[PDB]
Every structure is written in structure tokens, then in C-alpha cells.
Design a protein around this ligand. Structure first.
Ligand SMILES: COC(=O)c1ccccc1S(=O)(=O)NC(=O)Nc1nc(C)cc(C)n1
Ligand SMILES: COC(=O)c1ccccc1S(=O)(=O)NC(=O)Nc1nc(C)cc(C)n1
Lengths: 349, 350
């Protein structure tokens, strides 16, 4: 189950720009301590890993981690079982995993001075934000409160520390520059399929509107909904009658229409309440966010698209968290992704 | 195929680190975003580890430890896309571990809700960062004497400068002790192994070996900081500018230093390090004196019964290497010399 035969593997950097400090560089002067004087800095580049099987079948898959994560989540589960990288190389796809700009091996743009500041210019904010273990526990629906599991949970219990250790902050790089890096990757790769997660859901939809090479999207538990500009439907507040979901992203209709040209599937796990749940903010947040996504998919289908919502419990899979691809039944989750690729001919040459 | 690799298993995991906490209590009924430090537990200073195991390994696993401001990428591929040491040594039938140390790459960057590195009133790491430039790295790594210039017969993959410099970045002010601790924990998990270090990780690997008997060997590429027993640092000259000095050598208690005499240790240097003072080129001169200090460090280990050696790649017939010989155009020949070291000491045998 763990063996993989690779025709080739490797990694590379793509995308980004440069920024420059004041003055000139003199090789005769002390180079340490490091200075911005005469300095060129490469910023906002992205790390890319690939593994290619012998005799690939169909399109390469680009796995795009969610918010605060890295390509680790596609390599292995917190308890050390094979991730989707291994499973889909075994399924004879070439597999790309990325660390987007600002995360993991992607660039974090900081210099000599307060975090993110290049002399007088703020490239990213000095003040950061970051989830806690407690916030991520309820965000990912391990259970209703930190330290508590849903009875049906597919989470790999006992490996909580390993799981939360994979998460971290992201600097305030513009989403435009994150999308730009992936568009450049998609141009380099050729026709491919994006597999996204949580925060990278909306970003992958945006990439598809810029990149005809994206031939399909599967988004696990996307966090932000997308609509044509000026056509955001009525979305209710949360059950506390104060909070809202993430403001939906709006794009010009001429770009939105490109989403109708490819098959798109959104995948949701379990324990999302059907009814208002004022006691558990993130459970209720997922209820309304999933509802908003259902309207987004409907809008795509009204433009001639083929956009679907897969609730894993309807396929017989119970208890999945917001990371179904690292849960205990992730082989069965992978099978459903293989089914989608096969239905749409994305596993054929 | 030279690119083909067959893995019995591969994967990655997190190891090491600690937790820090914010004030107060977490209420799941209250808005979770915007994120807060209230009732917050944060995992900090953990390390990322990737492993690739061949079918029927022979000899000890290798732990490849990137230099300063780098990640495990430098062992995966060269800047122009040729196989890195990870592939080459899985093909050489070693299980290969590649790490992103705490503070780098997939390792943790310890920051919270607030100014970078600050958790309420506690400074976990400094808000003010430092970072090399392209120009600084160019001369640090001896591509040439000045940015844009290359030494004659250079083995750098010319044309791929963007790729190369894009792999570099900053490191927050995590204590070296905590970085060493993570790797000690990894060595405990793996068992007997060999450390392959680089630049800034050189001194750290030496430290790890003094705390971990499972380190059975060390190969260090262009180490940046020298190591000596406490109070026994030899006289080391200043640089040719008569004002600068190399990195303050690390000093450790002699009981721990003596542990370095129990295992084979090889330091490996590339080309273009001057033999004579070079005031016009700071980093070239730095390397001259730094390599000299390392020669003395190795001698001290040998006087205590050790098996320490210095390999200058030009003496082995390899010209033009930079400070990253394992990503240079002749990195297959560099790998061959590492294979030779492992075979000499039986570290390629079960
Ligand atoms: C893996 O989990 C998720 O990706 C994920 C899943 C659900 C909600 C949030 C995230 S997150 O981690 O991305 N968190 C954030 O980034 N916070 C945030 N994001 C936006 C866009 C706007 C605001 C106000 N906050
Ligand atoms: C890949 O190249 C190298 O590793 C490498 C190689 C040679 C010199 C420096 C580095 S570095 O990048 O580590 N740069 C540093 O900033 N080193 C450093 N600087 C200070 C001021 C204090 C200490 C302890 N180390």
C-alpha cells in the first residue's frame, strides 16, 4: 500500500517579483550583518513539488493546501498514513503539490527591519494574525468544542499535536499575487486539474477564470463563496444574528462564465448542522457557508455549467472533518475523487 | 533512468516544539474569526521532516540538514531541475530524511495575533527581522567575486539564478538550543544515522552529535561556524580589512566535545577560497579564515582521538564548486565522494 514508483520527482520555484533597497552593494565591505543597502530581494515566489509515475494516465493534479497549511497535508496524514500525493501517483497521475507564496517553502517577504517592512514601504503587515489550537479544532469540526470529538469522527485521534503542528500564520500577501503564481504554474504545466481546500477554494476558482488549462476543480470544504459582480444572493447572518460568513468574492461576469466550461465539484464532510446552532459559532458558520456555496454552484449551472455539491454522508462516508483527505477514511475519499476524474475523462490521455 | 526512483514508502511528519498560551478562556459560541489570543494554545518551534525509503535499504539513514535561510528543497532538486541528493541517495539505497528546521520552510514560524513574534507581553521571536540579499548571497556562496560575475570554470548552474535565489529567505530568532533539540528528538526517533549538514547547520549538527549517540557520522558541506572546547579557542586572525572577524566560534564543555572524537567526521569545501588575504572581497576572505578555523577545530577533535577530516574538492579533482556543491553541475561526482565516505566507515552496510 505504501510503495510508489516514480519516473521522476523534484521541486522548483515559480512566480514572484523583486523589490530593491536603497544604495549600492560593495563586495569589499562587511556583508554580515545583512543590510538592505544595494539589496535585491526575491519576494512572493511559490514552491512546487512534483512526482510523476511511470506511464501517467490523464491530466496532472495540482493539490493546493488550505489556509495556514502546506503541501504536507497531501503527503501524509497526522498519524502517518499515505496522503493523496502517494494515492494518486499510485492512481497513475502526475501529482503537483505547492506551498503557496507566504506559506511553508513559499516566500515570506521580510527584510532587514520590522517584519514585512522594506525601509519606508510596507510589503506585508508587521502585525500578524494566527489561529489557535482551539479555533482550529472547531473550525475543522473535530467536535463542537476544543478537546471534544463528535462520536462519529474520522479524525485520527491521538495525533492531535501532530495535526495542529502543521498549521501557521500567513503574511498579508495580496490574493492577486497568490493567484498570479498559480496561473504561472498552470501555464507551465499545461492542462491540469486543481484540487483545493478551504481558503484555496476561492483562489482556485479565480485561477480557472484566468487559465484555460484548468480543466476541472475539486474543492474540499471551500471557505469563501464566489459570485458574479452585483449578483450576490441573499445570505443570512449566523444564528447569533450578529455574525456573517466570509464576504463572497465578486468577479466580472465574463470571467465567472469561464467556470461553466469545466466540471466543478465541492466536497463537504459531516457534522454541518441543518438548523441554526447559536451555541457553536463555527458549526453554524459552516451551515451558512455551505448554503452560500450551493447558491454559487447554482449560478454556475444557470450559465450552462456542470457544478456539483458532494456531501460525503450521502456517499456513505460518515464523520469526516474539514480535512477529509487526511481523515481515517481518506482512501474512500480518494476513491470518490478518482470517480470524478474518471466520469469526466480526466484520467484518460 | 537517472531520474527514476522506487520508494518502499514516503511521507512526512512534525516533531519537536512546545506550546505557549494566551490569557483567558475560549468560548465556542463567540466569533472565532477574527482570530484572537484569548484562550489560545499555540504550537511553536516544531520541525517538518520528510522521509523516502528505498526497497531494502543498506546501511544507515541519512538526515540532510539545509543551511541558513534554506529548506529541504536544496536536497530535492538543483536550481536547474536536476536530481538532488535525496534522489541520488535513495538510489544509493539509503533511507533519506530531509528537514525544514524550526523557523524555516514547513517548520514553524512562531507568531500570533499582534506584532510579529509577540504573544501579548512575551517576545517569542524578534519583530525586527534580518535577511540576506541576492547580492549578499551571490558572494557568500562564491558564485563569483561580485554579483553578476562568475569564477572561471564555475560549476554553478548558470542561467538559473532566479530559481536559486528564490529558495532563500529569512529566519526568525528562534534559539539555537530549540533547533538542536528538535533534531535530537528526530535522531532518537530514527535510530542510528548520519547527519549531512550545510553552512549554518554545521555547528548545529556537531552539537546534536554531542547530545545524541545515534549520530554515527557527520559530513558537513561548507560549515559556517567553528566549534571548540570551552576556553580553548585558538588564536584566529582578523580578516584582511583588519577590522572584521569570522563568526565567533561556538564553545562547548569538553566532556561533550570529546563525543565528537567517537565518530567519523568530514568537512567538505568547494573552490575559490583564497589562500592569501583578499581585502577587496570580504566574503572570499571570510571563507579563508573560516576554513582555517575549521582546520583547527578538526585538529582538536583528532588530538582527542578522533577521526576528523577536511576534504577540499579540488584536491579530489573537482573544480569550480560553490558553497552548495550538492546542487552544482557536478553534484553527481560530489555525491560519489559522499558515497565513498559512507563506504569507508561501513555506514552503507547493515
Ligand atoms: C484550513 O482552514 C481554512 O483555510 C479555513 C476554513 C474556514 C474558515 C477560515 C479558514 S482560514 O484558515 O483560511 N482562516 C483565515 O484565513 N481567516 C480568514 N480568512 C479570510 C479570507 C477572511 C477572514 C476575515 N479571515
Ligand atoms: C547558506 O548559507 C549560510 O548558511 C551561511 C554561510 C556563511 C555565512 C553565513 C551564512 S547564513 O546564511 O547563516 N547567514 C547568517 O546570518 N549567519 C549568521 N549571522 C549572524 C549575524 C549570526 C549567526 C549566528 N549566523
Amino acid at each position: 500500500k505504501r510503495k510508489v514508483v516514480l519516473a521522476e520527482q523534484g521541486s522548483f520555484y515559480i512566480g514572484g517579483r523583486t523589490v530593491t533597497g536603497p544604495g549600492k552593494f560593495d563586495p569589499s565591505k562587511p556583508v554580515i550583518r545583512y543590510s538592505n543597502e544595494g539589496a535585491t530581494f526575491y519576494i512572493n515566489q511559490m514552491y512546487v513539488n512534483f512526482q510523476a509515475p511511470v506511464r501517467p494516465r490523464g491530466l496532472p493534479l495540482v493539490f493546493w493546501h488550505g489556509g495556514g497549511l502546506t503541501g504536507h497535508i497531501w503527503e501524509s496524514t497526522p498519524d502517518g498514513r499515505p496522503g493523496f500525493q502517494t494515492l494518486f501517483v499510485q492512481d497513475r497521475h502526475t501529482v503537483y503539490t505547492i506551498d503557496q507564496p507566504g506559506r511553508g517553502r513559499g516566500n515570506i517577504p521580510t527584510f532587514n527591519g520590522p517584519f514585512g517592512q522594506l525601509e519606508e514601504e510596507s510589503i506585508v503587515n508587521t502585525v500578524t494574525g494566527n489561529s489557535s489550537k482551539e479555533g482550529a479544532w472547531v473550525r475543522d469540526r473535530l467536535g463542537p468544542a476544543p478537546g471534544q470529538f463528535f462520536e462519529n469522527s474520522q479524525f485520527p485521534r491521538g495525533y492531535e499535536d501532530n495535526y495542529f503542528k502543521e498549521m501557521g500564520f500567513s503574511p498579508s500577501i495580496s490574493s492577486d499575487e497568490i493567484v498570479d503564481a498559480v496561473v504561472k504554474l498552470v501555464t507551465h504545466i499545461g492542462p491540469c486539474v486543481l484540487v483545493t481546500h478551504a481558503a484555496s477554494g476561492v483562489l482556485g476558482m479565480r485561477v480557472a477564470t484566468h487559465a484555460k488549462n484548468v480543466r476541472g476543480i475539486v474543492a474540499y470544504e471551500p471557505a469563501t463563496s464566489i459570485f458574479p459582480k452585483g449578483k450576490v444572493p441573499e445570505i443570512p447572518p449566523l444564528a447569533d444574528k450578529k455574525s456573517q460568513i466570509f464576504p463572497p468574492f465578486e468577479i466580472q461576469e465574463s470571467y465567472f462564465k469561464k467556470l461553466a466550461k469545466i466540471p466543478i465539484q465541492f466536497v463537504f464532510g459531516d457534522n454541518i448542522p441543518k438548523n441554526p446552532k447559536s451555541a457553536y459559532w463555527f458549526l453554524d458558520w459552516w451551515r451558512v457557508t455551505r448554503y452560500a456555496h450551493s447558491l454559487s454552484l447554482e449560478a454556475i449551472n444557470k450559465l450552462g455549467g456542470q457544478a456539483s455539491l458532494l456531501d460525503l454522508p450521502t456517499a456513505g462516508l460518515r464523520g469526516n472533518t474539514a480535512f477529509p483527505f487526511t481523515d481515517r477514511n481518506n482512501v474512500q475519499v480518494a476513491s470518490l475523487l478518482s470517480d470524478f476524474l474518471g466520469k469526466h475523462g480526466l484520467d484518460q490521455n
